[PDB]
Amino acid sequence: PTINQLVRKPRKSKVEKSDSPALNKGYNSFKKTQTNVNSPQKRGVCTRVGTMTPKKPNSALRKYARVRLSNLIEVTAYIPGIGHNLQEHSVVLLRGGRVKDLPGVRYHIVRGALDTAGVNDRKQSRSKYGTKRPK
Amino acid sequence: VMTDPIADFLTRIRNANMVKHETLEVPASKIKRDIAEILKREGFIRDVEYIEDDKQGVIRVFLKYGKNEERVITNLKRISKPGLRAYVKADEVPKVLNGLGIAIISTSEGVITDKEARAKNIGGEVIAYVW
RNA sequence: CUCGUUAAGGAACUCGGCAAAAUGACCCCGUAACUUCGGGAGAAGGGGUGCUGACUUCGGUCAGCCGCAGUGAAUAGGCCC
RNA sequence: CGCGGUGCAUUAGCUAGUUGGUGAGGUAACGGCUCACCAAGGCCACGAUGCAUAGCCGACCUGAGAGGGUGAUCGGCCACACUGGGACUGAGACACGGCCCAGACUCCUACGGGAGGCAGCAGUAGGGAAUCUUCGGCAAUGGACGAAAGUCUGACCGAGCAACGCCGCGUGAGUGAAGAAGGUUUUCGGAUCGUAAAACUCUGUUGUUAGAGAAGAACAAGGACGUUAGUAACUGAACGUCCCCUGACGGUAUCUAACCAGAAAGCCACGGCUAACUACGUGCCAGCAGCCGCGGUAAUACGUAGGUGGCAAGCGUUGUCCGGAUUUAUUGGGCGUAAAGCGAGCGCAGGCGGUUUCUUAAGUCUGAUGUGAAAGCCCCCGGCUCAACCGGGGAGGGUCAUUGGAAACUGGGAGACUUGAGUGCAGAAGAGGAGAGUGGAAUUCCAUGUGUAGCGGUGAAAUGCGUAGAUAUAUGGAGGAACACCAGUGGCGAAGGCGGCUCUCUGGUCUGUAACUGACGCUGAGGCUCGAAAGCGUGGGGAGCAAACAGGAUUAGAUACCCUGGUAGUCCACGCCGUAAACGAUGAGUGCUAAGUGUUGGAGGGUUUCCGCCCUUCAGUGCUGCAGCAAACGCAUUAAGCACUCCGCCUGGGGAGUACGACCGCAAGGUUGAAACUCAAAGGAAUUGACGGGGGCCCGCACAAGCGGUGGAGCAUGUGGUUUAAUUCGAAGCAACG
RNA sequence: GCCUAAGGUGGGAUAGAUGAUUGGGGUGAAGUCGUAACAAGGUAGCCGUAUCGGAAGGUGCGGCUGGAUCACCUCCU
RNA sequence: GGAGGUAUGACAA
Ligand SMILES: [K+]
Ligand SMILES: [K+]
Ligand SMILES: [K+]
Ligand SMILES: [K+]
Ligand SMILES: [K+]
Ligand SMILES: [K+]
Ligand SMILES: [Mg+2]
Ligand SMILES: [Mg+2]
Ligand SMILES: [Mg+2]
Ligand SMILES: [Mg+2]
Ligand SMILES: [Mg+2]
Ligand SMILES: [Mg+2]
Ligand SMILES: [Mg+2]
Ligand SMILES: [Mg+2]
Ligand SMILES: [Mg+2]
Ligand SMILES: [Mg+2]
Ligand SMILES: [Mg+2]
Ligand SMILES: [Mg+2]
Ligand SMILES: [Mg+2]
Ligand SMILES: [Mg+2]
Ligand SMILES: [Mg+2]
Ligand SMILES: [Mg+2]
Ligand SMILES: [Mg+2]
Ligand SMILES: [Mg+2]
Ligand SMILES: [Mg+2]
Incomplete structure (x- = not known):
C-alpha cells in the first residue's frame, strides 16, 4: 500500500477471539446483561449427563455433560477420567480446554472441587483428577 | 512525468552497472x-563530464570497475521516496554498512556525506544510500 | 310516547356498545405503519379562543380584568389496532 | 489557548442563544454566562452530529526496537457520595459522615409521630471462580482545636488471616559395598532401586526449654540558667545550654546456653515437537490428548508398579496480555496461476509533480535557556547476618516551549525557459461509432410445370412427412436473419465489442513539422457515463435456430445425452437491468535496461528505369531469447526486470458473497457486507508412480482362423452349505476346490 | 410572578431478551438414493443468466481455456 | 523439432 492509503485507512489488525467465550462473560440479575469478565473457572448445573460418539479415527463413548452456568449460558463439557458422581441437577465446576474428539465441547469438568467426586484409585497424575493421597 | 528524477538517475546507474555498461547520459540538475x-570524489565512479544544451544541461558519467569484471558499486537506494520524506538529526545520521558505503545527505551547509554531517553535528534530508 | 338531569361504578346490559352519551367551528403546532408516492390525513395527539387600554405597519404582541366555564347559547368528525 | 492520546460512515449532515455585534445585567473575574434588540451566520470528509466504550497520567507487563496491552497496589489531576435538583453558611462547598424538596428503600414507634443513607475501618447477607480481623495504640509521623498540658484522629503506626507473590534458609553432613534384605526386571548368570540403607563420628541452621534483653524517642510542656531587640522597668517574646519525663508493637526482634537427627518433600512429565524407559493388566473398550495423534491380544502415548528427568515448599492446570507471528509488514509483506487489479472509462476534491534566478522560512537542521514533580526503570554508592528490600546521588526521558542562526531539499511568493503536456501546418490508415437505404448466396414458405414411392432420421431403429402428389427437379414471388472468398497471434476502439455495399454526421490514433502556450501534467476516493449474453416492460415482427414442452427411442430408471416437432426468446425502436472464465485470469502513468526475427501504418536517407531492395527512426502487433526476476510454470523494450507517483484490493478454508441494515431495480435480483459455529488444514506449481470407455509402437492360444471339449446324463474325487457326538485342521478370483 | 427537578400523558426513535412456527448452515466409523466432477470421467469442463427437475444436475444463449484426440495454414528453432 | 489459429466398491489402519 501507499503511505497515502495507509493514512486514509490505517492497518486494522486481524481481529482475535477466544477458545472459550462462555468463560469471558458474566451476568448481573439487576440490569440483566452480559458482563465481560475474564474468569478462569465457572460454576454450573448439569442439565444432562450422557455419552457421545467421537470422530472417525477414534471410536469410544465419551462422557459429556450439558450444563447451565452462573451466567445463564448453556455449555457442553467433558467428564474426564474414569467414573463420576454426576447426575442432572448436580453442581459442577468447569475449566477451559477443547476435547479434540467432539467439536461441540470446548470445556472440561473439574474433579475434587464440588459435588464432583474425586477420581477413585488414581495414583499417578493425581492433582489432575483431584483425589487425595493414599497414606 | 518523472516524479523522482533523483531515483531515476540512481536506477539508471544501477541498470548500466548490472549490464556492465561503461558510460551514461542524463538530463541533469x-x-x-x-x-x-x-561519487567522483568518493571513489564509486571514474569520471563525470557536463554538456550544455538549450533545453537542459546533460550530465554524462563514466563508471568504474576494479577489472573488466568487478564492480565498485553494488546497489543504491533512495529513502526519501518522496511519498515519505526522510529527515534526520545529527544523531540519527545513518552509517551505511558500518562505513563501507555512504549515505548522501542535504543540509543547511549543502549536499554532503554522513561523514561531514556526523562531524559537524548537523542533519537534514537523506536522499540515497550506496552499498 | 317525546325530552331533560343524576350520587358511586362505568359495557358488568346485550346476540351484538342497539340506542343514547361523548367529539364537533376557527387559528397555530404536530402527525405513524403502509403506499399504486397521489395518498393515508381534518391521522393521531395537543394548546389557544371572552373583555378593556397600549402596540404595531395592522396579525400577530404586552399588561390588566372578570367569571366554574370565553366557537360561553344554536349549528358543525368519536378515534385507533 | 496550542498540541496529543478510542471504535463505527451497515452513523453525512449538525446548531438556533446556535454564530457574531450594540446595550444592559451578572460573576472573584473574561465572555451568550444571562435578557432584549440587529444581522444570518457558525461546525464538518483534516470526520462534525449520533451510537458504543472508557476516568486520564506518572507508570506496569512484554518486545531488538518500532510498537502492543493494562491503568491493581504508591503518587498527581478529575468526578461521585441512595437517585435528581437547589441554594444557605463560609475565605473555601453547591458539602461522604451538613440543610430543603421530589423519588426510591429501609428502620423504631406507646400508632400520636419520628429517623436514617458504610463507594470511611472492621464486619453481615447476596452475587460470584474468589479476595482479610466486627484487633491494639495515638509511642511514632501527620492533621484539627487550644497559650500550654492535653482532647480527638479506623489518617497513620502496628499486629492478625491467606504459600497470593518476590527473596532467603531448611527438611542434616562425613565415613560406609562389586553392593544387606525387600521392590522391579532378567537372556534366571545377573542388572537397578543403591553409599541409598544399617552401622559408627560430628552439628544444632531450625524446633523445644531456660535466662539476658535493643534501637525505633525526636520531643513538647515543666525546673533552671545565659544571649538578643523591645524596653521608663520588670514579666514576657525569639535564640542557645543543661535537668526532667514519654513505647501499642513487646519481654517481639536479638544474644547466650541444654537437648533431640531427631518433628519438617512433594508436584508434573517420560512417542516426537521436549530432558527423561521397561514390566504387568486392558484390548478402537476403558481412557489419553497443547499440536501431530495413541488405543482393534506383544501400547516406551490408557491405567498401575518400578525407574528416570524438570522444578522444589512449591508444582501443575485453566483464563488473561506480549512475543515468537514480517499472521495488518512505518521499521517490515503482497495482487499472472496460491488470497487479491474494481469490467472499462470522464473527471470534482485530495496525493504527487520538469529545469532555473531572486525571495521567504511553514516543513527541515541547529546553539543556548526553562520545564518534563516525587516514587519507579537504568548507572554508582551505602544499610538491613546476604538477598528481596530500603535509602542517597546521578543519568535519561518531550514528533515539548521561547529566543537566535543557516537554508542545500520540500513548501509559500515574484518571475524566466522548453524537453513534458497541448494547440497549429501537412500528410496516413482503419470490421471506430450512430442514422438512412441497397444488395447477391443459402434456407423456409407460396405459386406453376416434370415425375411417383418412398423421404427423413439412427449405434439400431422409431415418432414424423408422403399416393389428397412427398422428396427431388426447373422458373418466379413473399419474408426474415447473417455477410462465403478477401480474412491473417491482421486492424480500430477505454473496455464490451466491431467484418457485405454506398451515402450523411462524428470520434480517437500515428507520423513528420519545431510556428505557438509555457508544467497547463499524472493518478483520482466519492460521483457520472458506457457496458457480452441471458432477462424485464410497451408495440411490431418472426425465415431459420431453439430453452420450456410433446412424442418416439435408450436406460434398472432417464425429470438427459440421440431423433422428429416446437413455445418464449433470438430480430427492430424506446426504456429498464448492470452481471461474465467482463481473462493478457497481469490497474494507470513515466523513465532505464542484450539482441534476433516476422508483420501493420508512416517518415527520412542510399541506391534502383520505376517497381524493388538496403540503412535509420516512431507508433503498434506476434515469436525466440541474454541479464535479472520467479516457489515453480514461466516473463523478458507489448516485462511478471530496476525504479518512482497515485488508486483499487488480500490477510487461512467453510459458514457466505449468506444474514441484518442501507441504496438501486417494475421484477428477477444487483452494490456494500459481517458474526456465531466449524477444520488443522484448504491451496499453487512441479516430480515419481499408477490410471484413462487418451494417442502411438510391439508382443502373447489374447482375438481371428480352426480342432476337440466343459456346462445337459450317470459315476469318481474335492469343495461350499446342511446335518452330525464328531462329520479333525488348513487352503478361498486369476494365484482355493483329483 | 419567572426559571425549574421529579412526575403524568402522547406519538415516535433506538438497543436488547423472549416467541408458537419456520429457513437454510455446520458437525457426527461403517443408513438411503442416484453418480455430477477429476482421464476426452464416458454428453469436455467452468463462469453469468433464464428455465426445468427427487437430488446431484440437465437444456438454451453468450463467453473462456484453468480442453484430450486425429487432420490444414502461419510463426519460430 | 516445437508453438497460435483452423452404474457402484462398509470404517479405520
Ligand atoms: K469512570
Ligand atoms: K449527581
Ligand atoms: K502410561
Ligand atoms: K422483448
Ligand atoms: K499411460
Ligand atoms: K471477452
Ligand atoms: Mg351515573
Ligand atoms: Mg357481556
Ligand atoms: Mg349508534
Ligand atoms: Mg356554541
Ligand atoms: Mg518482535
Ligand atoms: Mg457514610
Ligand atoms: Mg527424548
Ligand atoms: Mg496423563
Ligand atoms: Mg500390554
Ligand atoms: Mg486467484
Ligand atoms: Mg521523576
Ligand atoms: Mg439481449
Ligand atoms: Mg518468450
Ligand atoms: Mg476362436
Ligand atoms: Mg457333467
Ligand atoms: Mg489338477
Ligand atoms: Mg460422471
Ligand atoms: Mg462429463
Ligand atoms: Mg429438459
Missing part, C-alpha cells in the same frame, strides 16, 4: 551534479 561529484 544541480542536485544530480552534486551527487555525481560526491
Whole structure:
C-alpha cells in the first residue's frame, strides 16, 4: 500500500477471539446483561449427563455433560477420567480446554472441587483428577 | 512525468552497472551534479563530464570497475521516496554498512556525506544510500 | 310516547356498545405503519379562543380584568389496532 | 489557548442563544454566562452530529526496537457520595459522615409521630471462580482545636488471616559395598532401586526449654540558667545550654546456653515437537490428548508398579496480555496461476509533480535557556547476618516551549525557459461509432410445370412427412436473419465489442513539422457515463435456430445425452437491468535496461528505369531469447526486470458473497457486507508412480482362423452349505476346490 | 410572578431478551438414493443468466481455456 | 523439432 492509503485507512489488525467465550462473560440479575469478565473457572448445573460418539479415527463413548452456568449460558463439557458422581441437577465446576474428539465441547469438568467426586484409585497424575493421597 | 528524477538517475546507474555498461547520459540538475561529484570524489565512479544544451544541461558519467569484471558499486537506494520524506538529526545520521558505503545527505551547509554531517553535528534530508 | 338531569361504578346490559352519551367551528403546532408516492390525513395527539387600554405597519404582541366555564347559547368528525 | 492520546460512515449532515455585534445585567473575574434588540451566520470528509466504550497520567507487563496491552497496589489531576435538583453558611462547598424538596428503600414507634443513607475501618447477607480481623495504640509521623498540658484522629503506626507473590534458609553432613534384605526386571548368570540403607563420628541452621534483653524517642510542656531587640522597668517574646519525663508493637526482634537427627518433600512429565524407559493388566473398550495423534491380544502415548528427568515448599492446570507471528509488514509483506487489479472509462476534491534566478522560512537542521514533580526503570554508592528490600546521588526521558542562526531539499511568493503536456501546418490508415437505404448466396414458405414411392432420421431403429402428389427437379414471388472468398497471434476502439455495399454526421490514433502556450501534467476516493449474453416492460415482427414442452427411442430408471416437432426468446425502436472464465485470469502513468526475427501504418536517407531492395527512426502487433526476476510454470523494450507517483484490493478454508441494515431495480435480483459455529488444514506449481470407455509402437492360444471339449446324463474325487457326538485342521478370483 | 427537578400523558426513535412456527448452515466409523466432477470421467469442463427437475444436475444463449484426440495454414528453432 | 489459429466398491489402519 501507499503511505497515502495507509493514512486514509490505517492497518486494522486481524481481529482475535477466544477458545472459550462462555468463560469471558458474566451476568448481573439487576440490569440483566452480559458482563465481560475474564474468569478462569465457572460454576454450573448439569442439565444432562450422557455419552457421545467421537470422530472417525477414534471410536469410544465419551462422557459429556450439558450444563447451565452462573451466567445463564448453556455449555457442553467433558467428564474426564474414569467414573463420576454426576447426575442432572448436580453442581459442577468447569475449566477451559477443547476435547479434540467432539467439536461441540470446548470445556472440561473439574474433579475434587464440588459435588464432583474425586477420581477413585488414581495414583499417578493425581492433582489432575483431584483425589487425595493414599497414606 | 518523472516524479523522482533523483531515483531515476540512481536506477539508471544501477541498470548500466548490472549490464556492465561503461558510460551514461542524463538530463541533469544541480542536485544530480552534486551527487555525481560526491561519487567522483568518493571513489564509486571514474569520471563525470557536463554538456550544455538549450533545453537542459546533460550530465554524462563514466563508471568504474576494479577489472573488466568487478564492480565498485553494488546497489543504491533512495529513502526519501518522496511519498515519505526522510529527515534526520545529527544523531540519527545513518552509517551505511558500518562505513563501507555512504549515505548522501542535504543540509543547511549543502549536499554532503554522513561523514561531514556526523562531524559537524548537523542533519537534514537523506536522499540515497550506496552499498 | 317525546325530552331533560343524576350520587358511586362505568359495557358488568346485550346476540351484538342497539340506542343514547361523548367529539364537533376557527387559528397555530404536530402527525405513524403502509403506499399504486397521489395518498393515508381534518391521522393521531395537543394548546389557544371572552373583555378593556397600549402596540404595531395592522396579525400577530404586552399588561390588566372578570367569571366554574370565553366557537360561553344554536349549528358543525368519536378515534385507533 | 496550542498540541496529543478510542471504535463505527451497515452513523453525512449538525446548531438556533446556535454564530457574531450594540446595550444592559451578572460573576472573584473574561465572555451568550444571562435578557432584549440587529444581522444570518457558525461546525464538518483534516470526520462534525449520533451510537458504543472508557476516568486520564506518572507508570506496569512484554518486545531488538518500532510498537502492543493494562491503568491493581504508591503518587498527581478529575468526578461521585441512595437517585435528581437547589441554594444557605463560609475565605473555601453547591458539602461522604451538613440543610430543603421530589423519588426510591429501609428502620423504631406507646400508632400520636419520628429517623436514617458504610463507594470511611472492621464486619453481615447476596452475587460470584474468589479476595482479610466486627484487633491494639495515638509511642511514632501527620492533621484539627487550644497559650500550654492535653482532647480527638479506623489518617497513620502496628499486629492478625491467606504459600497470593518476590527473596532467603531448611527438611542434616562425613565415613560406609562389586553392593544387606525387600521392590522391579532378567537372556534366571545377573542388572537397578543403591553409599541409598544399617552401622559408627560430628552439628544444632531450625524446633523445644531456660535466662539476658535493643534501637525505633525526636520531643513538647515543666525546673533552671545565659544571649538578643523591645524596653521608663520588670514579666514576657525569639535564640542557645543543661535537668526532667514519654513505647501499642513487646519481654517481639536479638544474644547466650541444654537437648533431640531427631518433628519438617512433594508436584508434573517420560512417542516426537521436549530432558527423561521397561514390566504387568486392558484390548478402537476403558481412557489419553497443547499440536501431530495413541488405543482393534506383544501400547516406551490408557491405567498401575518400578525407574528416570524438570522444578522444589512449591508444582501443575485453566483464563488473561506480549512475543515468537514480517499472521495488518512505518521499521517490515503482497495482487499472472496460491488470497487479491474494481469490467472499462470522464473527471470534482485530495496525493504527487520538469529545469532555473531572486525571495521567504511553514516543513527541515541547529546553539543556548526553562520545564518534563516525587516514587519507579537504568548507572554508582551505602544499610538491613546476604538477598528481596530500603535509602542517597546521578543519568535519561518531550514528533515539548521561547529566543537566535543557516537554508542545500520540500513548501509559500515574484518571475524566466522548453524537453513534458497541448494547440497549429501537412500528410496516413482503419470490421471506430450512430442514422438512412441497397444488395447477391443459402434456407423456409407460396405459386406453376416434370415425375411417383418412398423421404427423413439412427449405434439400431422409431415418432414424423408422403399416393389428397412427398422428396427431388426447373422458373418466379413473399419474408426474415447473417455477410462465403478477401480474412491473417491482421486492424480500430477505454473496455464490451466491431467484418457485405454506398451515402450523411462524428470520434480517437500515428507520423513528420519545431510556428505557438509555457508544467497547463499524472493518478483520482466519492460521483457520472458506457457496458457480452441471458432477462424485464410497451408495440411490431418472426425465415431459420431453439430453452420450456410433446412424442418416439435408450436406460434398472432417464425429470438427459440421440431423433422428429416446437413455445418464449433470438430480430427492430424506446426504456429498464448492470452481471461474465467482463481473462493478457497481469490497474494507470513515466523513465532505464542484450539482441534476433516476422508483420501493420508512416517518415527520412542510399541506391534502383520505376517497381524493388538496403540503412535509420516512431507508433503498434506476434515469436525466440541474454541479464535479472520467479516457489515453480514461466516473463523478458507489448516485462511478471530496476525504479518512482497515485488508486483499487488480500490477510487461512467453510459458514457466505449468506444474514441484518442501507441504496438501486417494475421484477428477477444487483452494490456494500459481517458474526456465531466449524477444520488443522484448504491451496499453487512441479516430480515419481499408477490410471484413462487418451494417442502411438510391439508382443502373447489374447482375438481371428480352426480342432476337440466343459456346462445337459450317470459315476469318481474335492469343495461350499446342511446335518452330525464328531462329520479333525488348513487352503478361498486369476494365484482355493483329483 | 419567572426559571425549574421529579412526575403524568402522547406519538415516535433506538438497543436488547423472549416467541408458537419456520429457513437454510455446520458437525457426527461403517443408513438411503442416484453418480455430477477429476482421464476426452464416458454428453469436455467452468463462469453469468433464464428455465426445468427427487437430488446431484440437465437444456438454451453468450463467453473462456484453468480442453484430450486425429487432420490444414502461419510463426519460430 | 516445437508453438497460435483452423452404474457402484462398509470404517479405520
Ligand atoms: K469512570
Ligand atoms: K449527581
Ligand atoms: K502410561
Ligand atoms: K422483448
Ligand atoms: K499411460
Ligand atoms: K471477452
Ligand atoms: Mg351515573
Ligand atoms: Mg357481556
Ligand atoms: Mg349508534
Ligand atoms: Mg356554541
Ligand atoms: Mg518482535
Ligand atoms: Mg457514610
Ligand atoms: Mg527424548
Ligand atoms: Mg496423563
Ligand atoms: Mg500390554
Ligand atoms: Mg486467484
Ligand atoms: Mg521523576
Ligand atoms: Mg439481449
Ligand atoms: Mg518468450
Ligand atoms: Mg476362436
Ligand atoms: Mg457333467
Ligand atoms: Mg489338477
Ligand atoms: Mg460422471
Ligand atoms: Mg462429463
Ligand atoms: Mg429438459
